[PDB]
Design a protein around this ligand. Structure first.
Ligand SMILES: Nc1ncnc2c1ncn2[C@@H]1O[C@H](COP(=O)(O)OP(=O)(O)NP(=O)(O)O)[C@@H](O)[C@H]1O
Ligand SMILES: [Mg+2]
Ligand SMILES: [Mg+2]
Length: 330
């Protein structure tokens, strides 16, 4: 399938309203219209999320709509044993962290995903099937990896299971409250700059039992939830710069231009780690966050064009299940 792309326009904030900064971003169904400060530029996406204002009610509905449209499907992907990824991309201040983690009063994608995961595993556990959940949480800053769950580490690409951070804590968790204290520990530990990338990973291992045979098999879904550094324009930006190159090359592939243009996955820590998320074995969505007002026109236009190329990336997601699991279905 193609990478799924959504644009989320955050509302005009207090400064932009106080100072009468012109709003240049309109949302029209699944299209974004960027008006000039000559002609309007129109971009089409899979979803567009918009907010009328920052009233408490519009905040509640905004986080809810994002989860309903993007989180439920990614959660279902993991219960089907797919690898899946949501990454948030856009300039500083545009709403990346608000979309992924949210706030205490307006929780975002990650807490909602974690809550729904344990509610479903608990509802669905029985004597024919059990679930194991593990989490990891890490940050890339200045091309170095740090374990946010540990009070440094290097990337390796496994021959079958893909790129991974070797030495990274991968913790078994049995309830939402367990994962919540880890999220809270990680979020406090995050370095506080717009130049760091944070990767939250959940591995869902579904074991199926054939009590007549005495056999069992595992189907494994993996969720990568990525809150990127701000897209606004050496070793400190290398990951972001290389992500742009990777997305542009892959978009060119997924249209016919350059069958084997060089996709520089290994030129940065971030793109090597997300190598399967982009063009590989993954159900992947991008959430491109943009600011609404005239003062960010060019950065918005850049984010919109990058999101527009991402939707041409072709992925190849297959179910990750061992031999027994496949047959135990029927
Ligand atoms: N969709 C939204 N609705 C309401 N308020 C929002 C929304 N998006 C962002 N905000 C507000 O704007 C602030 C900035 O958003 P935030 O998610 O922190 O931006 P960011 O893209 O992560 N910046 P950065 O980490 O520096 O690259 C948030 O703390 C919220 O108060
Ligand atoms: Mg997969
Ligand atoms: Mg942020």
């Amino acid at each position: 399938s193609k990478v799924k792309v959504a644009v989320r326009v955050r509302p005009m904030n207090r400064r932009e309203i106080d100072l009468h900064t012109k709003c240049v971003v309109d949302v029209e169904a699944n299209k974004v219209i960027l008006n000039p400060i000559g002609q309007p530029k129109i971009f089409a996406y899979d979803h567009c999320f918009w907010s009328m204002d920052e009233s408490v009610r519009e905040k509640y509905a905004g986080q809810d709509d994002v989860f309903k449209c993007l989180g439920e499907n990614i959660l279902q992907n993991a219960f089907d044993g797919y690898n899946a990824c949501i990454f948030a991309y856009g300039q500083t201040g545009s709403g990346k962290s608000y979309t992924m983690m949210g706030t205490a009063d307006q929780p975002g994608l990650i807490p909602r995903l974690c809550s729904g995961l344990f509610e479903r595993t608990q509802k669905e556990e029985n004597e024919e099937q059990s679930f194991k959940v593990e989490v990891s949480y890490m940050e890339i800053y200045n091309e170095k990896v740090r374990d946010l769950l540990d009070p440094t580490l290097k990337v390796r690409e496994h021959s079958v299971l893909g790129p991974y951070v070797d030495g990274l804590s991968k913790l078994a968790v049995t309830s939402y409250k367990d994962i919540e204290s880890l999220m809270s520990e990680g979020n406090k530990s995050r370095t506080e700059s717009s130049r760091s990338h944070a990767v939250f990973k959940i591995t869902l291992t579904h074991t199926l039992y054939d009590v007549k045979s005495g056999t069992s098999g595992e189907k494994v879904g993996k969720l990568s939830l990525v809150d990127l550094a701000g897209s606004e324009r050496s070793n400190i930006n290398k990951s972001l710069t290389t992500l742009g190159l990777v997305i542009s090359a892959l978009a060119d592939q997924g249209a016919g231009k350059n069958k084997n243009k060089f996709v520089p996955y290994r030129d940065s820590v971030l793109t090597w780690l997300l190598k399967d998320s982009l063009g590989g074995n993954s159900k992947t969505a991008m959430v491109a966050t943009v600011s609404p007002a005239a003062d960010n026109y060019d950065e918005t236009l850049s984010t919109l064009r990058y999101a527009d190329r991402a939707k041409h990336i072709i992925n190849h997601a297959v179910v990750n299940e061992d031999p027994n699991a496949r047959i135990i279905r029927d």
